[PDB]
Amino acid sequence: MKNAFFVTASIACGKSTFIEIANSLGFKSISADKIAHKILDENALELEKIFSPFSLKNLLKKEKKIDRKILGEIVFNNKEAKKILENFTHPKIRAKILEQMQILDKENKAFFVEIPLFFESGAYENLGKVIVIYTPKELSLKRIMQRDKLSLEAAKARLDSQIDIEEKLKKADFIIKNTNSYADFRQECVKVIQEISKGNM
Amino acid sequence: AMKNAFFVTASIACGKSTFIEIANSLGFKSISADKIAHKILDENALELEKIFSPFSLKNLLKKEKKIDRKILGEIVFNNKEAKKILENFTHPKIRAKILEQMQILDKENKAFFVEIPLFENLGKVIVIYTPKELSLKRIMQRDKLSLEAAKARLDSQIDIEEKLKKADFIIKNTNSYADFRQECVKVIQEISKG
Amino acid sequence: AMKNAFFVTASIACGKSTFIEIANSLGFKSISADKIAHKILDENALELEKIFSPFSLKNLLKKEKKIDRKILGEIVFNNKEAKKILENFTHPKIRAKILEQMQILDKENKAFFVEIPLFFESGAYENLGKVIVIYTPKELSLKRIMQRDKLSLEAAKARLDSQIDIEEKLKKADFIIKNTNSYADFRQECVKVIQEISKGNM
Amino acid sequence: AMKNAFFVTASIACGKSTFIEIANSLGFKSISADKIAHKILDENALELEKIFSPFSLKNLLKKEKKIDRKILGEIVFNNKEAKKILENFTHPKIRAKILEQMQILDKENKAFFVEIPLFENLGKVIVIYTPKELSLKRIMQRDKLSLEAAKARLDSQIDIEEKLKKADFIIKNTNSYADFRQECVKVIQEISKG
């Protein structure tokens, strides 16, 4: 598809701000996150059957709404549980996303799919062009311990993620740098959408 | 080995917990991997807020610096990197905590029971056993599951069968609950004389 | 992207090599993924010695800028860090050399076959061309594997898991050649498909 | 739990082997993860050929029904599935033998050294330390590695650094070999009485 523009981001707030802006300028946005969530609610009753032997704490919260707090404990506690939920959810997530992305490509106006950087349900780099809002960060262990004031284990944790973020840029189509002030980052999203808006991208 | 340590594994969840509750009610101490993990997350709540606050636009602390396990589960759900980053931070701490806790209890010269993490030469083994045709087809059609989901479940079933081999005690989690309950006490009684 | 490219992969090794023996005889070009892979280790023999020598007291280099593949495999089997480095070292080199030799034969405008191990690593090759899986169905029953194949629980588990994974991989094949019956019958089928391809009919 | 168990881990491989050699010459036994694994492979050669014969046209067994470890690396190299199957089958048996062995030597009431597997609240920790500017940038240029490769290396470096915190013996891997050796012997004498 041709009007498909994923928007993902090294920091979660970049993701959303660009989405706030594209919206006002008369463009439409799908939220991969809202979709995934929607999935868990529509299959409540099968989810309870599948996951209930894993706990005594009931999975259904009310009238066919799934207890997410409980489900996330179950998968965190239980590697079998974790693989079953993954495989149960991937096809459904993939399928819904891909459904709505054909609803709008045909509508022939550029559209944006807002999606977390390491979202699992497929390899979406095929479907459209990817926009990654990247904030480059220090990859030095010591400087993060001193900066954000952390133990080694927590700095390890933070550093491994920033290193894994930078790798993902090899998969991007458009990178918007986000190293300067809020209002300044803002205009750059504005500029980009415009270029998309006249077939320049 | 480690003298008084007993690991409990069950085919179904509610077997385990029935055993461990009964053992508790008869004065025996137990360690819960799930509960260890839970305290680890609160014990590290602030660290986690900084590691994981760029992933979401929601506050990861709920009130009085405790961690929101709803939100952490959301940030983690369907995210390869957040799963990995959390696992790698927490799993080490969980392992150590367990081992630390095993050693203490062992020094009290009374049998105690460790619920094996679902994230052993070290002690003796009790498996709470519920027979099952170890069959991918049965699992798929009974439980209504895909191919790879069923294999996850099947591999857990095979893991228990493996343990049946050198189990020091096997407790059949039969169709009669009340029976199975008294199958537990007799084991615990036999454990207590040694 | 390439029209003349066919991946040949198999649920068991002889399935793949027979379809290739027959494809060659019928005059079509094949490249081997594992051969290309093996040659990457030798072309980068000096750099690998530097990177991996700190994991062993032994020598990686066997003779004249050649890699002792026995030792290197012991290193990566014994060391998680070595394994990841090797994977990241080789993957892009394998990927560009495979994609080097497939753009040669695609413009050469005759059908060709990339022999490849079913779970090969160095990229997602499904998007480059068409995938031919030679499949031999199996009973996904633990107990029937211990009997027939005379194995312990543990080894049966391994065998069963791999079979399950194999079936998973078909969800991404374009063309599945069954392989349940005799040798002879399997060979005929290869020829029927290679022909159907030969006409550009497939 | 095991009073006599000492775990050795080093920043570079040769620090670890020097120290173990010196400890072996002074009469202290040692457990090699790498050797245990080696023995598991030969122990299970028959089953391994049956698991792995569908991956390769080659013979996986040598004369004297020994495993062919060249051929098994060829089948596993760049094959995600063969790796997983091999790791899943062997790793448990390796871990069990490590502990089975640890427990036997600890009954001899003599200090012994466990070479930590590179594929620890059960004993004491000896870290054989070679300081390093724990920087990804330095690792990529000093070692000629890409982003993810240097990451794997860096991560290993941080794991050594995590164990500096509570280690019982830290031995600097100086720039003199000779003295580093002397650093080893004092430690081992230190350990020999207490």
CATH label of the domain that carries residue D27: 3.40.50.300
Report residue D98 as tokens: 């490590």
Specify the DSSP class assigned to residue C60. Answer: S
Q: Which residues of C touch D86 (CB under 8 A)?
A: 77
Q: In what order do the strands lie in the sheet with C175-177?
A: C29-32, C112-115, C5-10, C130-134, C175-177
Please identify among residues 22-81 of chain A the ones whose CB lies closer than 8 Å to any CB of chain B.
36-37, 46, 49-50, 53-56, 68-69, 71-73, 75-80
Determine contact: B2 vs chain D, CB below 8 A. Answer: yes
Answer yes or no: are the C-beta atoms of A129 and A173 closer than 8 Å: yes
Q: What is the resolution of this structure in A?
A: 2.6
Domain count, chain C: 1
- Annotated binding-site positions of D for ATP: 13-18
- Known binder of ligand: residue B13? yes
Please identify among residues 130-169 of chain A the ones whose CB lies closer than 8 Å to any CB of chain B.
148, 150-151, 153-154, 156-158, 160-161, 164
Would residue A134 be called left, alpha or beta, if left means φ above 0 and alpha means ψ between -120 and 50 degrees? beta
Burial class for C81, CB neighbours closer than 10 Å (0-12, 13-18, 19+): buried
Q: Report helix, strand or coil for D138.
A: helix
Nearest to C100 by CA among C186, C21, C33, C53: C33
DSSP notation for chain B:
--TTEEEEEESSHHHHHHHHHHHHHTT--EEEHHHHHHHHHHHTHHHHHHHHTTT-SS-SEEETTEE-HHHHHHHHTTBHHHHHHHHHHHHHHHHHHHHHHHHHHHTTTS-EEEE-----TTSEEEEEE-----BHHHHHHHHT--HHHHHHHHHHHHHHHHHHTT-SEEEE--S-HHHHHHHHHHHHHHHHH-
Residue contact D1–B103, C-beta within 8 A:
yes
Q: Report helix, strand or coil for C165.
A: helix
Distance from CA of A121 to the nearest CA of B (A): 7
Answer yes or no: are the C-beta atoms of B73 and A81 closer than 8 Å: no
Strand B61-63 with B66-67, pairing: antiparallel
CA dist list (Å): A42 to A36, A46, A74:
10, 9, 19
How far is residue C75's CA from residue C81's CA, in Å, rounded to a whole number?
Answer: 10
- Known binder of ligand: residue A16? yes
Q: How many residues does chain A have?
A: 201
Residue-range definition of the domain harbouring residue A172? 2-200
**Strand positions, DSSP E, chain A:** 4-9, 28-31, 60-62, 65-66, 111-114, 129-134, 174-177
